[PDB]
Amino acid sequence: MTITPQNLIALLPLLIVGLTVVVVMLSIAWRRNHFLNATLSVIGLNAALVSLWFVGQAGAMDVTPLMRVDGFAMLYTGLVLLASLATCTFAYPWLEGYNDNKDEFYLLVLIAALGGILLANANHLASLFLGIELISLPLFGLVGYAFRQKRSLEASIKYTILSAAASSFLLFGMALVYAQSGDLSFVALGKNLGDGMLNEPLLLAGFGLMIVGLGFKLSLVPFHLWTPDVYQGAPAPVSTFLATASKIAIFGVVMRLFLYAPVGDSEAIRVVLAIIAFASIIFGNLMALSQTNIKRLLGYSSISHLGYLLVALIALQTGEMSMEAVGVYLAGYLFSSLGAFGVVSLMSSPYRSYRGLFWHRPILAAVMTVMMLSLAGIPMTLGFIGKFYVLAVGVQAHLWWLVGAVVVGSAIGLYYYLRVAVSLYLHAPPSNWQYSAGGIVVLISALLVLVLGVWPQPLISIVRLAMPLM
Amino acid sequence: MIPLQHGLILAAILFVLGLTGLVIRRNLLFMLIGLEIMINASALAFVVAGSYWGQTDGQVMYILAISLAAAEASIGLALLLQLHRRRQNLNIDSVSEMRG
Amino acid sequence: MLLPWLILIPFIGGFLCWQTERFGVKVPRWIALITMGLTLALSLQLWLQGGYSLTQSAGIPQWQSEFDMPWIPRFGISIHLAIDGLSLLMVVLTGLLGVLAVLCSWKEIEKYQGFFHLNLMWILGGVIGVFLAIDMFLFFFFWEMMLVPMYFLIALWGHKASDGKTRITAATKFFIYTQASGLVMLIAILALVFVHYNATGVWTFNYEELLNTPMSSGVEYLLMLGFFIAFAVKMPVVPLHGWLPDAHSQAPTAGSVDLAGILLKTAAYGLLRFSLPLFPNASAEFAPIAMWLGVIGIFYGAWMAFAQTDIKRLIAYTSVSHMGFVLIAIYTGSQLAYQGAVIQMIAHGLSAAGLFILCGQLYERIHTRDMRMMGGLWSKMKWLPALSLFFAVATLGMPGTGNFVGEFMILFGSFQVVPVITVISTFGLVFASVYSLAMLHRAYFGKAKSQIASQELPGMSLRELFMILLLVVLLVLLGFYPQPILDTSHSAIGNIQQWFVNSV
Amino acid sequence: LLKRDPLNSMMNIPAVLSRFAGKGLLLSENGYLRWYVASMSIGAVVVLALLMVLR
Ligand SMILES: CCCCCCCCCCCCCCCCCC(=O)OC[C@H](COP(=O)(O)OCCN)OC(=O)CCCCCCCCCCCCCCCCC
Ligand SMILES: CCCCCCCCCCCCCCCCCC(=O)OC[C@H](COP(=O)(O)OCCN)OC(=O)CCCCCCCCCCCCCCCCC
Ligand SMILES: CCCCCCCCCCCCCCCCCC(=O)OC[C@H](COP(=O)(O)OCCN)OC(=O)CCCCCCCCCCCCCCCCC
Ligand SMILES: CCCCCCCCCCCCCCCCCCCC
């Protein structure tokens, strides 16, 4: 299929972010200016976020034998773009203290955002693979951006080796799937099977290797052991981006792949993902019980939240609001993780103990305790709305083991989240507008969490508007 | 007249051999070598799958595979170079400071 | 009409308490006092204008006042409030206990009194919203939003003599118990809503619509079990009870947190309002297990209360025993036992509020809570030992106090239903008298067993004596004239009892 | 006999079970990259075997 001007206007955030990559690269080639390159990157990401309006007025259509644009793609593109914008905003005061070159950071953030947009728009195995790699490799650079530090270099090496292994696993999986089916489109993965013979062994093994790669990319048990180390060792804006944008884009493409494929309603795949989600929730909540480090704690939190996401994933073909639950939960999780990792970044900036935070930084302490109440699914917070959606979807499809796992993991998460949120207020022994901009970002994130936890109807209507093709 | 199953078996054998070399070797260079073996075996499987169906999609996926392999080898060898420059060893078990 | 203002006046009052701290350190206590004064005035105005004594039982639903607003129209969720006799009585009790909680912490001139007052008002607003909401999602929302300020008050403003880690552990255990039970309740609510949606095809969370829902036997049992697990954690019912002495031990020294949301019995109201009408056959099947749990709770709480060397834990276990009495009353299916349960909850709230206030005063004078470090305090204090004697005689079920009236109507209805549980519960009343006498004589009688108990102590303040004597007068008037309270709640009790016995 | 609240310990038994399970599960995070790759291959074997058994 050729490309039309309507297909070009469907390509608007991808083209805008790519043009931003080229412009920022040429500006770095002209003269190394941190402020101007950061401003150009933020301008390009905001331009793509604005041009999502024109993409929405363009309608839902198919641009490539690879790409499909609908409201689902707009919602995930907007989430990825917002996460990238917050990552740049948090990264500028951190990069104010970096002795080496700071301008490549925003180039890598823009390329990873480009990969996230491609993963949001992906309707093909090639686009899935290229979006995963386009997210992964700039994250290899960003995790080891402070390569002089021991922890950052260790996390970069671990992430690079493990993600190369997961990329090979995923690629061999789609190789087996394409050997079985003969078409790499999402809709044709198992379309040549009928009369109850959907569980062909080669297709199931290829999808299993794809599950191995994606469950690495989604921090799902037992491909989750990288998450606390890579989260801790990486810089805190990089931890923010890796927690929000990569996970959201990869889960969106997994959502689209399991909706569109005929093999997605297989019983064996459903049971395997049920086991993975159960173990992910239980293990991620249990392993964060005795964590004194905030970053590893939030990595195990990411594992648990992705387990709740997979619980919402499993009931896709049976329930009707599974995608709506995933969208509401992902908006809430983006806001909560953005706020928490942003306060962590603002306390880690510039590049050179959360106890007693209220006595010198009260606003950041309030924002942190709002997000740790949000990640626990406490009412008046958007994470509660997401957990309620997950529980409703689990109750509809009679996923009782998953529902009990969500309740037990919620209790354990309540324990450690409240431990940190109340360690904030105990007793223990800047001056630029970009730090204030990061503070405004985390403050609006906390206000959004509180308002959409009290009044979740506009977000529900927005997510219900983001309906993919049938 | 070449069976598809034999080519897929060869690709799987090279894939699991690359994984074995990735696991059992402490040296980061040999793990990078094993990763190259795994991704090249996956590219071989995709080429065989494309050749059975008479489609260019297998070779296109091979091209994407080797683009990823080249860039990943570049990044991994840069990380290995910095590890050898500041640590004077390639023992991947020595870099284990972050745990628990 | 006035119900949204009844819920929202504590929240606006708490926001004003936090904001008006810059005007002075002695300002937020006055703001909280006028806030609960307005709340209690509105509650008494609803009592006067409701005409509850002339209201006859017409069947569920029958609300004396009603408010509705769409909140989440996607799920059919509405802010839907409704007040009737039982809800109005518990709202009046909430307002009075909030007035007592504000007056009990009058001498705290701490530099962060605004947040303490705001958390107290948010707790009281959550309790009022629990007593007023007839929407399942809104009721659960209030049920879980009233626990965060309790957690922060226990953890940060709690017992200053104890270590911080004990306060954190007690607050975390209380929060984990209450919120896990609430999540089980939310699962039961969601499954009931999905059953109704599959049966009819409309999205609703309204409790009036969910009443006529056809459920198979066994699914209804599971939903009732989820509701009862939530209410059994919050009541408390054994073994879901240790959070109550743990939170009472590490509570703030004034005792306002006890009066705010802990001592108000929302769980038994939920059992009367939601567990019995929505699942009548399941509750009829579950009645022996629940009432034997109540018997075990009465005797377990009595044996724990006798064995405590701490006053606060002792009063918490008295609360456990009296809630076991109420739990026995709830599953009888008798109008007399239900009216006695209502009287018992109100009288227990009053008596335990007086006991906790006086325990706070006694700890203020003697700077300890161990009963082995005191004794013979009748000669060393002016007003406190006699009022504590009156309250300890009140909680053992003495006529002239409302506890006797409530417990005896409970036992009359229960004996009309089942004799064995009634006779075992009356021996539980003997046990209650035993622990009350043990507390009285270990605390105020004998010789001084330490040095701080052998010195003269200053008398109680005029405001504190005023509120204690107000509690005394209210308990005496409830003991001798409980009739207006009985005619206030006669319609709601009649509707609930007729729905329970006419659908089984 | 009951002054130590046996039912409180009975319901606190899940808390110590969760603590023990978390302490045992944290031993898998030894920080070694080769063990991480081995765990990924173990998960691949387990997922593939479960998919073949349930097919
Ligand atoms: C009627 C029974 C059936 C229905 C049950 C419904 C559920 C709600 C009612 C039961 C709740 C039981 C909760 C028990 C634990 C209470 C929390 C607690 O004790 O926290 C304190 C403790 C830490 O205290 P400490 O030991 O001082 O710490 C220093 C050590 N470094 O913290 C810890 O040690 C860590 C706490 C981790 C999180 C709590 C444990 C969660 C367990 C699963 C919850 C769901 C219940 C499932 C069924 C359990 C069996 C009945
Ligand atoms: C750790 C804390 C949480 C506890 C673990 C998580 C919850 C576990 C719940 C287990 C439920 C087991 C159900 C087993 C039978 C399922 C199949 C079945 O019989 O379905 C019947 C029915 C579907 O058929 P339908 O045509 O809709 O018939 C309408 C019938 N009224 O089905 C329906 O209409 C829906 C049936 C729903 C049943 C109730 C589920 C929730 C009940 C409350 C929570 C569990 C019980 C309380 C806590 C226990 C101790 C922790
Ligand atoms: C980290 C580790 C530690 C923490 C975690 C510990 C474990 C957490 C999970 C514990 C709960 C496990 C699941 C319990 C519910 C099982 C439900 C079940 O099996 O239901 C089967 C059946 C469903 O009903 P059905 O036959 O479909 O009805 C329609 C046709 N008549 O049901 C029926 O027919 C009715 C069955 C009734 C009895 C089963 C429910 C028992 C509930 C026990 C707790 C409450 C006990 C009572 C109250 C005590 C005080 C609160
Ligand atoms: C919810 C709070 C309840 C507090 C206790 C109230 C007990 C009832 C008191 C009623 C008043 C008794 C004394 C006055 C009697 C007036 C009789 C008028 C008609 C003859």
UniProtKB/TrEMBL annotation, chain A:
The Gene Ontology biological process annotation of the record reads:
ATP synthesis coupled electron transport
Which Pfam family, any one, appears in the UniProt record? Answer: Proton_antipo_M
Q: What Gene Ontology terms describe where this protein resides (cellular component)?
A: endomembrane system; plasma membrane
Q: Recorded E.C. number(s)?
A: 7.1.1.-
Report the enzyme's class at the first EC level.
translocase
Main localization, broad class: membrane
* Entry membrane topology: Multi-pass membrane protein
Query: Which catalysed reactions does the entry list for this protein?
Result: a quinone + NADH + 5 H(+)(in) = a quinol + NAD(+) + 4 H(+)(out)
* Annotated NADH:quinone oxidoreductase/Mrp antiporter transmembrane domain residues: 122-412
Q: From the Swiss-Prot or TrEMBL record, what is one GO molecular function term?
A: NADH dehydrogenase (quinone) (non-electrogenic) activity
Q: Which PANTHER family match?
A: NADH DEHYDROGENASE (PTHR22773)
Stated name of the protein = NADH-quinone oxidoreductase subunit N
Automatic annotation (TrEMBL), chain C:
Q: Which GO terms describe its molecular function?
A: NADH dehydrogenase (ubiquinone) activity; NADH dehydrogenase activity; ubiquinone binding
Asked whether the keyword Oxidoreductase is assigned, the reply is: yes
Location(s), subcellular: Endomembrane system; Membrane
Tell me which Gene Ontology terms the entry assigns under biological process. ATP synthesis coupled electron transport; electron transport coupled proton transport
Location of the NADH:quinone oxidoreductase/Mrp antiporter transmembrane domain? 134-429
One of the record's GO cellular component terms:
endomembrane system
Q: Which residues form a coiled coil?
A: none
Looking at the record's lineage, which domain of life comes first?
Bacteria
Can you tell me where the transmembrane regions are? 6-23, 30-48, 77-103, 115-134, 140-159, 180-199, 219-244, 256-274, 286-307, 314-333, 345-363, 383-405, 417-440, 461-481
One Pfam assignment? Proton_antipo_M
Q: Does the keyword Hydrolase apply?
A: no
Sorted keywords for this record are: Membrane, Oxidoreductase, Transmembrane, Transmembrane helix, Ubiquinone
Q: Its topology with respect to the membrane? A: Multi-pass membrane protein
What family is this? Belongs to the complex I subunit 4 family.
Instruction: Give the protein's recorded name.
Output: NADH-quinone oxidoreductase subunit M
From TrEMBL, chain D:
- Subcellular locations according to the entry: Cell inner membrane; Membrane
Transmembrane domains' residue ranges = 35-54
Note the coiled coil stretches, chain numbering: none
Q: What does this protein do?
A: NDH-1 shuttles electrons from NADH, via FMN and iron-sulfur (Fe-S) centers, to quinones in the respiratory chain. The immediate electron acceptor for the enzyme in this species is believed to be ubiquinone. Couples the redox reaction to proton translocation (for every two electrons transferred, four hydrogen ions are translocated across the cytoplasmic membrane), and thus conserves the redox energy in a proton gradient.
Q: Which family does it belong to?
A: Belongs to the complex I subunit 5 family.
| UniProt subunit comment | Composed of 13 different subunits. Subunits NuoA, H, J, K, L, M, N constitute the membrane sector of the complex.
Query: What name has this protein been given in UniProt?
Result: NADH-quinone oxidoreductase subunit L
The source organism is Escherichia coli
Give the stretch of the parent protein shown, with its full length: 559 to 613 of 613
